[PDB]
mmCIF file with all atom_site columns, all heavy atoms in Angstrom:
data_model
loop_
_atom_site.group_PDB
_atom_site.id
_atom_site.type_symbol
_atom_site.label_atom_id
_atom_site.label_alt_id
_atom_site.label_comp_id
_atom_site.label_asym_id
_atom_site.label_entity_id
_atom_site.label_seq_id
_atom_site.pdbx_PDB_ins_code
_atom_site.Cartn_x
_atom_site.Cartn_y
_atom_site.Cartn_z
_atom_site.occupancy
_atom_site.B_iso_or_equiv
_atom_site.pdbx_formal_charge
_atom_site.auth_seq_id
_atom_site.auth_comp_id
_atom_site.auth_asym_id
_atom_site.auth_atom_id
_atom_site.pdbx_PDB_model_num
ATOM 1   N N   . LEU A 1 1  ? 11.902 6.840   -26.378 1.00 63.24 ? 1  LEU A N   1
ATOM 2   C CA  . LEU A 1 1  ? 11.090 7.888   -26.986 1.00 63.24 ? 1  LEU A CA  1
ATOM 3   C C   . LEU A 1 1  ? 10.829 7.628   -28.465 1.00 63.24 ? 1  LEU A C   1
ATOM 4   O O   . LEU A 1 1  ? 9.777  8.023   -28.979 1.00 63.24 ? 1  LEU A O   1
ATOM 5   C CB  . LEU A 1 1  ? 11.771 9.246   -26.803 1.00 63.24 ? 1  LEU A CB  1
ATOM 6   C CG  . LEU A 1 1  ? 11.090 10.453  -27.455 1.00 63.24 ? 1  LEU A CG  1
ATOM 7   C CD1 . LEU A 1 1  ? 9.623  10.531  -27.061 1.00 63.24 ? 1  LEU A CD1 1
ATOM 8   C CD2 . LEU A 1 1  ? 11.811 11.737  -27.076 1.00 63.24 ? 1  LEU A CD2 1
ATOM 9   N N   . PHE A 1 2  ? 11.759 6.975   -29.160 1.00 64.70 ? 2  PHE A N   1
ATOM 10  C CA  . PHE A 1 2  ? 11.640 6.727   -30.590 1.00 64.70 ? 2  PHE A CA  1
ATOM 11  C C   . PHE A 1 2  ? 11.779 5.239   -30.876 1.00 64.70 ? 2  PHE A C   1
ATOM 12  O O   . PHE A 1 2  ? 12.605 4.553   -30.265 1.00 64.70 ? 2  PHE A O   1
ATOM 13  C CB  . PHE A 1 2  ? 12.703 7.501   -31.382 1.00 64.70 ? 2  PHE A CB  1
ATOM 14  C CG  . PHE A 1 2  ? 12.861 8.930   -30.950 1.00 64.70 ? 2  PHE A CG  1
ATOM 15  C CD1 . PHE A 1 2  ? 13.792 9.277   -29.985 1.00 64.70 ? 2  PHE A CD1 1
ATOM 16  C CD2 . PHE A 1 2  ? 12.085 9.928   -31.515 1.00 64.70 ? 2  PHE A CD2 1
ATOM 17  C CE1 . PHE A 1 2  ? 13.942 10.591  -29.588 1.00 64.70 ? 2  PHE A CE1 1
ATOM 18  C CE2 . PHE A 1 2  ? 12.231 11.245  -31.122 1.00 64.70 ? 2  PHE A CE2 1
ATOM 19  C CZ  . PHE A 1 2  ? 13.161 11.577  -30.157 1.00 64.70 ? 2  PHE A CZ  1
ATOM 20  N N   . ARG A 1 3  ? 10.966 4.747   -31.809 1.00 65.86 ? 3  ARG A N   1
ATOM 21  C CA  . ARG A 1 3  ? 11.063 3.371   -32.272 1.00 65.86 ? 3  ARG A CA  1
ATOM 22  C C   . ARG A 1 3  ? 10.323 3.259   -33.597 1.00 65.86 ? 3  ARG A C   1
ATOM 23  O O   . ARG A 1 3  ? 9.261  3.861   -33.773 1.00 65.86 ? 3  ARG A O   1
ATOM 24  C CB  . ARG A 1 3  ? 10.483 2.387   -31.249 1.00 65.86 ? 3  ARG A CB  1
ATOM 25  C CG  . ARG A 1 3  ? 10.888 0.941   -31.488 1.00 65.86 ? 3  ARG A CG  1
ATOM 26  C CD  . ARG A 1 3  ? 10.327 0.020   -30.418 1.00 65.86 ? 3  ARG A CD  1
ATOM 27  N NE  . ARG A 1 3  ? 10.824 -1.345  -30.555 1.00 65.86 ? 3  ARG A NE  1
ATOM 28  C CZ  . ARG A 1 3  ? 10.193 -2.322  -31.194 1.00 65.86 ? 3  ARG A CZ  1
ATOM 29  N NH1 . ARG A 1 3  ? 9.025  -2.124  -31.785 1.00 65.86 ? 3  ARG A NH1 1
ATOM 30  N NH2 . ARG A 1 3  ? 10.749 -3.529  -31.244 1.00 65.86 ? 3  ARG A NH2 1
ATOM 31  N N   . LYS A 1 4  ? 10.893 2.485   -34.524 1.00 66.22 ? 4  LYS A N   1
ATOM 32  C CA  . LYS A 1 4  ? 10.317 2.391   -35.862 1.00 66.22 ? 4  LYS A CA  1
ATOM 33  C C   . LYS A 1 4  ? 8.933  1.753   -35.833 1.00 66.22 ? 4  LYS A C   1
ATOM 34  O O   . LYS A 1 4  ? 8.018  2.210   -36.528 1.00 66.22 ? 4  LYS A O   1
ATOM 35  C CB  . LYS A 1 4  ? 11.250 1.598   -36.778 1.00 66.22 ? 4  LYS A CB  1
ATOM 36  C CG  . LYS A 1 4  ? 12.559 2.306   -37.092 1.00 66.22 ? 4  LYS A CG  1
ATOM 37  C CD  . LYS A 1 4  ? 12.359 3.433   -38.095 1.00 66.22 ? 4  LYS A CD  1
ATOM 38  C CE  . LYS A 1 4  ? 13.629 4.247   -38.277 1.00 66.22 ? 4  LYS A CE  1
ATOM 39  N NZ  . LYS A 1 4  ? 14.621 3.552   -39.142 1.00 66.22 ? 4  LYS A NZ  1
ATOM 40  N N   . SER A 1 5  ? 8.758  0.700   -35.037 1.00 67.51 ? 5  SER A N   1
ATOM 41  C CA  . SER A 1 5  ? 7.513  -0.052  -34.999 1.00 67.51 ? 5  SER A CA  1
ATOM 42  C C   . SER A 1 5  ? 7.013  -0.163  -33.567 1.00 67.51 ? 5  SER A C   1
ATOM 43  O O   . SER A 1 5  ? 7.798  -0.161  -32.614 1.00 67.51 ? 5  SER A O   1
ATOM 44  C CB  . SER A 1 5  ? 7.690  -1.456  -35.596 1.00 67.51 ? 5  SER A CB  1
ATOM 45  O OG  . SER A 1 5  ? 8.693  -2.180  -34.905 1.00 67.51 ? 5  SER A OG  1
ATOM 46  N N   . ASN A 1 6  ? 5.694  -0.259  -33.428 1.00 64.88 ? 6  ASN A N   1
ATOM 47  C CA  . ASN A 1 6  ? 5.086  -0.405  -32.113 1.00 64.88 ? 6  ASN A CA  1
ATOM 48  C C   . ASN A 1 6  ? 5.387  -1.784  -31.539 1.00 64.88 ? 6  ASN A C   1
ATOM 49  O O   . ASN A 1 6  ? 5.399  -2.787  -32.259 1.00 64.88 ? 6  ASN A O   1
ATOM 50  C CB  . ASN A 1 6  ? 3.575  -0.193  -32.202 1.00 64.88 ? 6  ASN A CB  1
ATOM 51  C CG  . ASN A 1 6  ? 3.196  1.272   -32.302 1.00 64.88 ? 6  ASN A CG  1
ATOM 52  O OD1 . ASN A 1 6  ? 4.053  2.134   -32.499 1.00 64.88 ? 6  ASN A OD1 1
ATOM 53  N ND2 . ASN A 1 6  ? 1.907  1.560   -32.167 1.00 64.88 ? 6  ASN A ND2 1
ATOM 54  N N   . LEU A 1 7  ? 5.632  -1.830  -30.233 1.00 62.04 ? 7  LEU A N   1
ATOM 55  C CA  . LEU A 1 7  ? 5.947  -3.090  -29.575 1.00 62.04 ? 7  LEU A CA  1
ATOM 56  C C   . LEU A 1 7  ? 4.743  -4.021  -29.584 1.00 62.04 ? 7  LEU A C   1
ATOM 57  O O   . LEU A 1 7  ? 3.601  -3.593  -29.392 1.00 62.04 ? 7  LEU A O   1
ATOM 58  C CB  . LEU A 1 7  ? 6.397  -2.842  -28.136 1.00 62.04 ? 7  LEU A CB  1
ATOM 59  C CG  . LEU A 1 7  ? 7.847  -2.397  -27.941 1.00 62.04 ? 7  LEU A CG  1
ATOM 60  C CD1 . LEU A 1 7  ? 8.064  -1.921  -26.516 1.00 62.04 ? 7  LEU A CD1 1
ATOM 61  C CD2 . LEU A 1 7  ? 8.804  -3.528  -28.279 1.00 62.04 ? 7  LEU A CD2 1
ATOM 62  N N   . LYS A 1 8  ? 5.005  -5.304  -29.810 1.00 63.95 ? 8  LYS A N   1
ATOM 63  C CA  . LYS A 1 8  ? 3.976  -6.322  -29.709 1.00 63.95 ? 8  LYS A CA  1
ATOM 64  C C   . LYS A 1 8  ? 3.669  -6.612  -28.243 1.00 63.95 ? 8  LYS A C   1
ATOM 65  O O   . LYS A 1 8  ? 4.454  -6.270  -27.355 1.00 63.95 ? 8  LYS A O   1
ATOM 66  C CB  . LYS A 1 8  ? 4.423  -7.596  -30.417 1.00 63.95 ? 8  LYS A CB  1
ATOM 67  C CG  . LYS A 1 8  ? 4.741  -7.403  -31.893 1.00 63.95 ? 8  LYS A CG  1
ATOM 68  C CD  . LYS A 1 8  ? 5.140  -8.709  -32.571 1.00 63.95 ? 8  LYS A CD  1
ATOM 69  C CE  . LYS A 1 8  ? 6.402  -9.308  -31.966 1.00 63.95 ? 8  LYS A CE  1
ATOM 70  N NZ  . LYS A 1 8  ? 6.861  -10.509 -32.716 1.00 63.95 ? 8  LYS A NZ  1
ATOM 71  N N   . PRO A 1 9  ? 2.526  -7.236  -27.959 1.00 68.05 ? 9  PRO A N   1
ATOM 72  C CA  . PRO A 1 9  ? 2.184  -7.526  -26.561 1.00 68.05 ? 9  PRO A CA  1
ATOM 73  C C   . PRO A 1 9  ? 3.256  -8.370  -25.886 1.00 68.05 ? 9  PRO A C   1
ATOM 74  O O   . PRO A 1 9  ? 3.821  -9.288  -26.485 1.00 68.05 ? 9  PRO A O   1
ATOM 75  C CB  . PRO A 1 9  ? 0.855  -8.284  -26.667 1.00 68.05 ? 9  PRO A CB  1
ATOM 76  C CG  . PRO A 1 9  ? 0.298  -7.917  -27.997 1.00 68.05 ? 9  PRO A CG  1
ATOM 77  C CD  . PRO A 1 9  ? 1.470  -7.664  -28.892 1.00 68.05 ? 9  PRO A CD  1
ATOM 78  N N   . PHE A 1 10 ? 3.528  -8.048  -24.622 1.00 70.76 ? 10 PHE A N   1
ATOM 79  C CA  . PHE A 1 10 ? 4.518  -8.772  -23.826 1.00 70.76 ? 10 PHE A CA  1
ATOM 80  C C   . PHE A 1 10 ? 5.869  -8.812  -24.536 1.00 70.76 ? 10 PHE A C   1
ATOM 81  O O   . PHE A 1 10 ? 6.544  -9.843  -24.579 1.00 70.76 ? 10 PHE A O   1
ATOM 82  C CB  . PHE A 1 10 ? 4.031  -10.186 -23.506 1.00 70.76 ? 10 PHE A CB  1
ATOM 83  C CG  . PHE A 1 10 ? 2.682  -10.228 -22.842 1.00 70.76 ? 10 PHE A CG  1
ATOM 84  C CD1 . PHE A 1 10 ? 1.769  -11.219 -23.165 1.00 70.76 ? 10 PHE A CD1 1
ATOM 85  C CD2 . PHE A 1 10 ? 2.328  -9.280  -21.897 1.00 70.76 ? 10 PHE A CD2 1
ATOM 86  C CE1 . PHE A 1 10 ? 0.529  -11.262 -22.557 1.00 70.76 ? 10 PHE A CE1 1
ATOM 87  C CE2 . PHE A 1 10 ? 1.088  -9.318  -21.287 1.00 70.76 ? 10 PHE A CE2 1
ATOM 88  C CZ  . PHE A 1 10 ? 0.188  -10.311 -21.618 1.00 70.76 ? 10 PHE A CZ  1
ATOM 89  N N   . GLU A 1 11 ? 6.268  -7.674  -25.101 1.00 69.62 ? 11 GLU A N   1
ATOM 90  C CA  . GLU A 1 11 ? 7.530  -7.542  -25.813 1.00 69.62 ? 11 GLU A CA  1
ATOM 91  C C   . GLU A 1 11 ? 8.372  -6.453  -25.164 1.00 69.62 ? 11 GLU A C   1
ATOM 92  O O   . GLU A 1 11 ? 7.842  -5.436  -24.704 1.00 69.62 ? 11 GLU A O   1
ATOM 93  C CB  . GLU A 1 11 ? 7.301  -7.212  -27.292 1.00 69.62 ? 11 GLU A CB  1
ATOM 94  C CG  . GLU A 1 11 ? 8.557  -7.301  -28.148 1.00 69.62 ? 11 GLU A CG  1
ATOM 95  C CD  . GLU A 1 11 ? 8.379  -6.669  -29.515 1.00 69.62 ? 11 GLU A CD  1
ATOM 96  O OE1 . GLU A 1 11 ? 7.220  -6.488  -29.942 1.00 69.62 ? 11 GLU A OE1 1
ATOM 97  O OE2 . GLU A 1 11 ? 9.399  -6.354  -30.162 1.00 69.62 ? 11 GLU A OE2 1
ATOM 98  N N   . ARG A 1 12 ? 9.685  -6.672  -25.129 1.00 68.76 ? 12 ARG A N   1
ATOM 99  C CA  . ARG A 1 12 ? 10.631 -5.721  -24.566 1.00 68.76 ? 12 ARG A CA  1
ATOM 100 C C   . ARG A 1 12 ? 11.684 -5.379  -25.609 1.00 68.76 ? 12 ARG A C   1
ATOM 101 O O   . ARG A 1 12 ? 12.163 -6.258  -26.332 1.00 68.76 ? 12 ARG A O   1
ATOM 102 C CB  . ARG A 1 12 ? 11.309 -6.282  -23.308 1.00 68.76 ? 12 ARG A CB  1
ATOM 103 C CG  . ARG A 1 12 ? 12.218 -5.289  -22.593 1.00 68.76 ? 12 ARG A CG  1
ATOM 104 C CD  . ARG A 1 12 ? 13.202 -5.987  -21.668 1.00 68.76 ? 12 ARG A CD  1
ATOM 105 N NE  . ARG A 1 12 ? 12.533 -6.695  -20.582 1.00 68.76 ? 12 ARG A NE  1
ATOM 106 C CZ  . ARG A 1 12 ? 12.222 -7.985  -20.595 1.00 68.76 ? 12 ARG A CZ  1
ATOM 107 N NH1 . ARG A 1 12 ? 12.496 -8.755  -21.636 1.00 68.76 ? 12 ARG A NH1 1
ATOM 108 N NH2 . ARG A 1 12 ? 11.619 -8.516  -19.536 1.00 68.76 ? 12 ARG A NH2 1
ATOM 109 N N   . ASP A 1 13 ? 12.038 -4.098  -25.682 1.00 69.46 ? 13 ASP A N   1
ATOM 110 C CA  . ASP A 1 13 ? 13.083 -3.612  -26.575 1.00 69.46 ? 13 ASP A CA  1
ATOM 111 C C   . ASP A 1 13 ? 14.139 -2.904  -25.739 1.00 69.46 ? 13 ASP A C   1
ATOM 112 O O   . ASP A 1 13 ? 13.853 -1.877  -25.114 1.00 69.46 ? 13 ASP A O   1
ATOM 113 C CB  . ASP A 1 13 ? 12.510 -2.668  -27.634 1.00 69.46 ? 13 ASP A CB  1
ATOM 114 C CG  . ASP A 1 13 ? 13.584 -2.053  -28.510 1.00 69.46 ? 13 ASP A CG  1
ATOM 115 O OD1 . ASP A 1 13 ? 14.697 -2.616  -28.576 1.00 69.46 ? 13 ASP A OD1 1
ATOM 116 O OD2 . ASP A 1 13 ? 13.315 -1.005  -29.135 1.00 69.46 ? 13 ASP A OD2 1
ATOM 117 N N   . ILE A 1 14 ? 15.350 -3.452  -25.731 1.00 69.38 ? 14 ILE A N   1
ATOM 118 C CA  . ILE A 1 14 ? 16.459 -2.897  -24.968 1.00 69.38 ? 14 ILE A CA  1
ATOM 119 C C   . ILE A 1 14 ? 17.572 -2.401  -25.891 1.00 69.38 ? 14 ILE A C   1
ATOM 120 O O   . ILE A 1 14 ? 18.714 -2.251  -25.460 1.00 69.38 ? 14 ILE A O   1
ATOM 121 C CB  . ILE A 1 14 ? 16.995 -3.917  -23.949 1.00 69.38 ? 14 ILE A CB  1
ATOM 122 C CG1 . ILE A 1 14 ? 17.337 -5.238  -24.643 1.00 69.38 ? 14 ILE A CG1 1
ATOM 123 C CG2 . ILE A 1 14 ? 15.974 -4.146  -22.844 1.00 69.38 ? 14 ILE A CG2 1
ATOM 124 C CD1 . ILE A 1 14 ? 18.310 -6.100  -23.868 1.00 69.38 ? 14 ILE A CD1 1
ATOM 125 N N   . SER A 1 15 ? 17.253 -2.144  -27.157 1.00 69.58 ? 15 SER A N   1
ATOM 126 C CA  . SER A 1 15 ? 18.258 -1.664  -28.096 1.00 69.58 ? 15 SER A CA  1
ATOM 127 C C   . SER A 1 15 ? 18.755 -0.286  -27.680 1.00 69.58 ? 15 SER A C   1
ATOM 128 O O   . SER A 1 15 ? 17.963 0.596   -27.334 1.00 69.58 ? 15 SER A O   1
ATOM 129 C CB  . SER A 1 15 ? 17.676 -1.613  -29.508 1.00 69.58 ? 15 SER A CB  1
ATOM 130 O OG  . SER A 1 15 ? 18.522 -0.888  -30.383 1.00 69.58 ? 15 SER A OG  1
ATOM 131 N N   . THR A 1 16 ? 20.074 -0.104  -27.715 1.00 71.74 ? 16 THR A N   1
ATOM 132 C CA  . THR A 1 16 ? 20.702 1.161   -27.361 1.00 71.74 ? 16 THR A CA  1
ATOM 133 C C   . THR A 1 16 ? 21.322 1.869   -28.558 1.00 71.74 ? 16 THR A C   1
ATOM 134 O O   . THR A 1 16 ? 21.967 2.908   -28.379 1.00 71.74 ? 16 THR A O   1
ATOM 135 C CB  . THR A 1 16 ? 21.776 0.937   -26.289 1.00 71.74 ? 16 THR A CB  1
ATOM 136 O OG1 . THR A 1 16 ? 22.685 -0.082  -26.723 1.00 71.74 ? 16 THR A OG1 1
ATOM 137 C CG2 . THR A 1 16 ? 21.137 0.519   -24.973 1.00 71.74 ? 16 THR A CG2 1
ATOM 138 N N   . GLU A 1 17 ? 21.147 1.342   -29.766 1.00 71.25 ? 17 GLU A N   1
ATOM 139 C CA  . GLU A 1 17 ? 21.708 1.978   -30.948 1.00 71.25 ? 17 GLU A CA  1
ATOM 140 C C   . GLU A 1 17 ? 21.011 3.306   -31.223 1.00 71.25 ? 17 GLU A C   1
ATOM 141 O O   . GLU A 1 17 ? 19.829 3.490   -30.917 1.00 71.25 ? 17 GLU A O   1
ATOM 142 C CB  . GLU A 1 17 ? 21.577 1.057   -32.162 1.00 71.25 ? 17 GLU A CB  1
ATOM 143 C CG  . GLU A 1 17 ? 22.501 1.416   -33.315 1.00 71.25 ? 17 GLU A CG  1
ATOM 144 C CD  . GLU A 1 17 ? 23.959 1.137   -33.006 1.00 71.25 ? 17 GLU A CD  1
ATOM 145 O OE1 . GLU A 1 17 ? 24.238 0.513   -31.960 1.00 71.25 ? 17 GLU A OE1 1
ATOM 146 O OE2 . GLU A 1 17 ? 24.827 1.541   -33.808 1.00 71.25 ? 17 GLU A OE2 1
ATOM 147 N N   . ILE A 1 18 ? 21.761 4.239   -31.808 1.00 72.38 ? 18 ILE A N   1
ATOM 148 C CA  . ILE A 1 18 ? 21.222 5.567   -32.082 1.00 72.38 ? 18 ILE A CA  1
ATOM 149 C C   . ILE A 1 18 ? 20.073 5.440   -33.070 1.00 72.38 ? 18 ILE A C   1
ATOM 150 O O   . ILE A 1 18 ? 20.236 4.904   -34.173 1.00 72.38 ? 18 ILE A O   1
ATOM 151 C CB  . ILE A 1 18 ? 22.319 6.497   -32.614 1.00 72.38 ? 18 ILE A CB  1
ATOM 152 C CG1 . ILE A 1 18 ? 23.547 6.474   -31.698 1.00 72.38 ? 18 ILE A CG1 1
ATOM 153 C CG2 . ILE A 1 18 ? 21.789 7.918   -32.750 1.00 72.38 ? 18 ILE A CG2 1
ATOM 154 C CD1 . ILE A 1 18 ? 23.237 6.706   -30.232 1.00 72.38 ? 18 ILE A CD1 1
ATOM 155 N N   . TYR A 1 19 ? 18.901 5.934   -32.678 1.00 71.70 ? 19 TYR A N   1
ATOM 156 C CA  . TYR A 1 19 ? 17.738 5.887   -33.552 1.00 71.70 ? 19 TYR A CA  1
ATOM 157 C C   . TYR A 1 19 ? 17.920 6.840   -34.727 1.00 71.70 ? 19 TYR A C   1
ATOM 158 O O   . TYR A 1 19 ? 18.375 7.975   -34.562 1.00 71.70 ? 19 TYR A O   1
ATOM 159 C CB  . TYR A 1 19 ? 16.475 6.249   -32.773 1.00 71.70 ? 19 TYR A CB  1
ATOM 160 C CG  . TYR A 1 19 ? 15.205 6.164   -33.589 1.00 71.70 ? 19 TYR A CG  1
ATOM 161 C CD1 . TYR A 1 19 ? 14.533 4.958   -33.740 1.00 71.70 ? 19 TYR A CD1 1
ATOM 162 C CD2 . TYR A 1 19 ? 14.678 7.289   -34.209 1.00 71.70 ? 19 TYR A CD2 1
ATOM 163 C CE1 . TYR A 1 19 ? 13.372 4.875   -34.484 1.00 71.70 ? 19 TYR A CE1 1
ATOM 164 C CE2 . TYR A 1 19 ? 13.518 7.216   -34.956 1.00 71.70 ? 19 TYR A CE2 1
ATOM 165 C CZ  . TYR A 1 19 ? 12.869 6.007   -35.090 1.00 71.70 ? 19 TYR A CZ  1
ATOM 166 O OH  . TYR A 1 19 ? 11.713 5.929   -35.833 1.00 71.70 ? 19 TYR A OH  1
ATOM 167 N N   . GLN A 1 20 ? 17.556 6.373   -35.919 1.00 69.98 ? 20 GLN A N   1
ATOM 168 C CA  . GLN A 1 20 ? 17.673 7.151   -37.148 1.00 69.98 ? 20 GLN A CA  1
ATOM 169 C C   . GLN A 1 20 ? 16.271 7.490   -37.639 1.00 69.98 ? 20 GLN A C   1
ATOM 170 O O   . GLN A 1 20 ? 15.507 6.595   -38.018 1.00 69.98 ? 20 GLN A O   1
ATOM 171 C CB  . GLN A 1 20 ? 18.456 6.380   -38.208 1.00 69.98 ? 20 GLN A CB  1
ATOM 172 C CG  . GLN A 1 20 ? 18.924 7.235   -39.377 1.00 69.98 ? 20 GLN A CG  1
ATOM 173 C CD  . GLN A 1 20 ? 19.436 6.415   -40.550 1.00 69.98 ? 20 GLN A CD  1
ATOM 174 O OE1 . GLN A 1 20 ? 19.401 6.867   -41.695 1.00 69.98 ? 20 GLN A OE1 1
ATOM 175 N NE2 . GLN A 1 20 ? 19.922 5.208   -40.272 1.00 69.98 ? 20 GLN A NE2 1
ATOM 176 N N   . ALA A 1 21 ? 15.938 8.778   -37.633 1.00 68.80 ? 21 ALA A N   1
ATOM 177 C CA  . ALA A 1 21 ? 14.648 9.255   -38.114 1.00 68.80 ? 21 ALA A CA  1
ATOM 178 C C   . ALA A 1 21 ? 14.686 9.696   -39.571 1.00 68.80 ? 21 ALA A C   1
ATOM 179 O O   . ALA A 1 21 ? 13.652 10.114  -40.102 1.00 68.80 ? 21 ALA A O   1
ATOM 180 C CB  . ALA A 1 21 ? 14.158 10.415  -37.241 1.00 68.80 ? 21 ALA A CB  1
ATOM 181 N N   . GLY A 1 22 ? 15.843 9.616   -40.225 1.00 67.43 ? 22 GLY A N   1
ATOM 182 C CA  . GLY A 1 22 ? 15.967 10.023  -41.611 1.00 67.43 ? 22 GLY A CA  1
ATOM 183 C C   . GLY A 1 22 ? 16.713 9.008   -42.452 1.00 67.43 ? 22 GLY A C   1
ATOM 184 O O   . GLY A 1 22 ? 16.952 7.881   -42.010 1.00 67.43 ? 22 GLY A O   1
ATOM 185 N N   . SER A 1 23 ? 17.085 9.399   -43.669 1.00 67.07 ? 23 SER A N   1
ATOM 186 C CA  . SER A 1 23 ? 17.804 8.524   -44.584 1.00 67.07 ? 23 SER A CA  1
ATOM 187 C C   . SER A 1 23 ? 19.317 8.675   -44.487 1.00 67.07 ? 23 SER A C   1
ATOM 188 O O   . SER A 1 23 ? 20.039 8.015   -45.242 1.00 67.07 ? 23 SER A O   1
ATOM 189 C CB  . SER A 1 23 ? 17.357 8.793   -46.025 1.00 67.07 ? 23 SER A CB  1
ATOM 190 O OG  . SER A 1 23 ? 17.924 7.852   -46.920 1.00 67.07 ? 23 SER A OG  1
ATOM 191 N N   . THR A 1 24 ? 19.813 9.520   -43.585 1.00 68.63 ? 24 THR A N   1
ATOM 192 C CA  . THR A 1 24 ? 21.248 9.725   -43.438 1.00 68.63 ? 24 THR A CA  1
ATOM 193 C C   . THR A 1 24 ? 21.807 8.719   -42.440 1.00 68.63 ? 24 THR A C   1
ATOM 194 O O   . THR A 1 24 ? 21.417 8.752   -41.265 1.00 68.63 ? 24 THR A O   1
ATOM 195 C CB  . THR A 1 24 ? 21.544 11.138  -42.964 1.00 68.63 ? 24 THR A CB  1
ATOM 196 O OG1 . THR A 1 24 ? 21.002 11.329  -41.651 1.00 68.63 ? 24 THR A OG1 1
ATOM 197 C CG2 . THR A 1 24 ? 20.936 12.161  -43.915 1.00 68.63 ? 24 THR A CG2 1
ATOM 198 N N   . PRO A 1 25 ? 22.703 7.817   -42.846 1.00 67.82 ? 25 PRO A N   1
ATOM 199 C CA  . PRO A 1 25 ? 23.273 6.872   -41.878 1.00 67.82 ? 25 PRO A CA  1
ATOM 200 C C   . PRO A 1 25 ? 23.998 7.597   -40.753 1.00 67.82 ? 25 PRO A C   1
ATOM 201 O O   . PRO A 1 25 ? 24.676 8.603   -40.971 1.00 67.82 ? 25 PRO A O   1
ATOM 202 C CB  . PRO A 1 25 ? 24.238 6.031   -42.722 1.00 67.82 ? 25 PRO A CB  1
ATOM 203 C CG  . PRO A 1 25 ? 23.770 6.192   -44.125 1.00 67.82 ? 25 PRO A CG  1
ATOM 204 C CD  . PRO A 1 25 ? 23.197 7.570   -44.212 1.00 67.82 ? 25 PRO A CD  1
ATOM 205 N N   . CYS A 1 26 ? 23.846 7.070   -39.536 1.00 68.51 ? 26 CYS A N   1
ATOM 206 C CA  . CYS A 1 26 ? 24.521 7.665   -38.386 1.00 68.51 ? 26 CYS A CA  1
ATOM 207 C C   . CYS A 1 26 ? 26.009 7.340   -38.389 1.00 68.51 ? 26 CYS A C   1
ATOM 208 O O   . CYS A 1 26 ? 26.839 8.201   -38.075 1.00 68.51 ? 26 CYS A O   1
ATOM 209 C CB  . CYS A 1 26 ? 23.869 7.183   -37.091 1.00 68.51 ? 26 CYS A CB  1
ATOM 210 S SG  . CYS A 1 26 ? 22.087 7.467   -37.007 1.00 68.51 ? 26 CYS A SG  1
ATOM 211 N N   . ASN A 1 27 ? 26.366 6.105   -38.742 1.00 69.08 ? 27 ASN A N   1
ATOM 212 C CA  . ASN A 1 27 ? 27.760 5.663   -38.742 1.00 69.08 ? 27 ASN A CA  1
ATOM 213 C C   . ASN A 1 27 ? 28.404 5.883   -37.375 1.00 69.08 ? 27 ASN A C   1
ATOM 214 O O   . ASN A 1 27 ? 29.561 6.294   -37.270 1.00 69.08 ? 27 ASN A O   1
ATOM 215 C CB  . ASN A 1 27 ? 28.560 6.371   -39.838 1.00 69.08 ? 27 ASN A CB  1
ATOM 216 C CG  . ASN A 1 27 ? 28.154 5.932   -41.231 1.00 69.08 ? 27 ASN A CG  1
ATOM 217 O OD1 . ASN A 1 27 ? 27.736 4.793   -41.440 1.00 69.08 ? 27 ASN A OD1 1
ATOM 218 N ND2 . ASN A 1 27 ? 28.275 6.838   -42.195 1.00 69.08 ? 27 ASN A ND2 1
ATOM 219 N N   . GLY A 1 28 ? 27.646 5.606   -36.316 1.00 70.65 ? 28 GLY A N   1
ATOM 220 C CA  . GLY A 1 28 ? 28.161 5.766   -34.971 1.00 70.65 ? 28 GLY A CA  1
ATOM 221 C C   . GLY A 1 28 ? 28.236 7.195   -34.489 1.00 70.65 ? 28 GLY A C   1
ATOM 222 O O   . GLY A 1 28 ? 28.938 7.472   -33.513 1.00 70.65 ? 28 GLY A O   1
ATOM 223 N N   . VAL A 1 29 ? 27.531 8.115   -35.143 1.00 70.88 ? 29 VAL A N   1
ATOM 224 C CA  . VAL A 1 29 ? 27.535 9.529   -34.784 1.00 70.88 ? 29 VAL A CA  1
ATOM 225 C C   . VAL A 1 29 ? 26.108 9.942   -34.457 1.00 70.88 ? 29 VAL A C   1
ATOM 226 O O   . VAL A 1 29 ? 25.185 9.674   -35.235 1.00 70.88 ? 29 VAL A O   1
ATOM 227 C CB  . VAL A 1 29 ? 28.110 10.401  -35.916 1.00 70.88 ? 29 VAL A CB  1
ATOM 228 C CG1 . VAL A 1 29 ? 28.231 11.849  -35.463 1.00 70.88 ? 29 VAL A CG1 1
ATOM 229 C CG2 . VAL A 1 29 ? 29.459 9.863   -36.369 1.00 70.88 ? 29 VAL A CG2 1
ATOM 230 N N   . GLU A 1 30 ? 25.931 10.593  -33.311 1.00 68.04 ? 30 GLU A N   1
ATOM 231 C CA  . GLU A 1 30 ? 24.627 11.063  -32.863 1.00 68.04 ? 30 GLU A CA  1
ATOM 232 C C   . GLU A 1 30 ? 24.490 12.548  -33.170 1.00 68.04 ? 30 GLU A C   1
ATOM 233 O O   . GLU A 1 30 ? 25.399 13.334  -32.882 1.00 68.04 ? 30 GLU A O   1
ATOM 234 C CB  . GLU A 1 30 ? 24.442 10.812  -31.366 1.00 68.04 ? 30 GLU A CB  1
ATOM 235 C CG  . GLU A 1 30 ? 23.031 11.074  -30.865 1.00 68.04 ? 30 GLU A CG  1
ATOM 236 C CD  . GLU A 1 30 ? 22.844 10.681  -29.413 1.00 68.04 ? 30 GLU A CD  1
ATOM 237 O OE1 . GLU A 1 30 ? 23.744 10.020  -28.853 1.00 68.04 ? 30 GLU A OE1 1
ATOM 238 O OE2 . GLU A 1 30 ? 21.797 11.033  -28.830 1.00 68.04 ? 30 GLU A OE2 1
ATOM 239 N N   . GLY A 1 31 ? 23.356 12.926  -33.753 1.00 68.48 ? 31 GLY A N   1
ATOM 240 C CA  . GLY A 1 31 ? 23.113 14.309  -34.113 1.00 68.48 ? 31 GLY A CA  1
ATOM 241 C C   . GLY A 1 31 ? 21.882 14.475  -34.979 1.00 68.48 ? 31 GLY A C   1
ATOM 242 O O   . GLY A 1 31 ? 20.817 13.937  -34.662 1.00 68.48 ? 31 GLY A O   1
#
C-alpha cells in the first residue's frame, strides 16, 4: 500500500520493513 518511489517496469519489491511516512524513526516499532 505504501512505497517511497514508484516501481520501475518489470520490477518487484518484497521489502517487509515498516514503512515510514514521517521523520520519526520507527526503530523496529510500528505505529
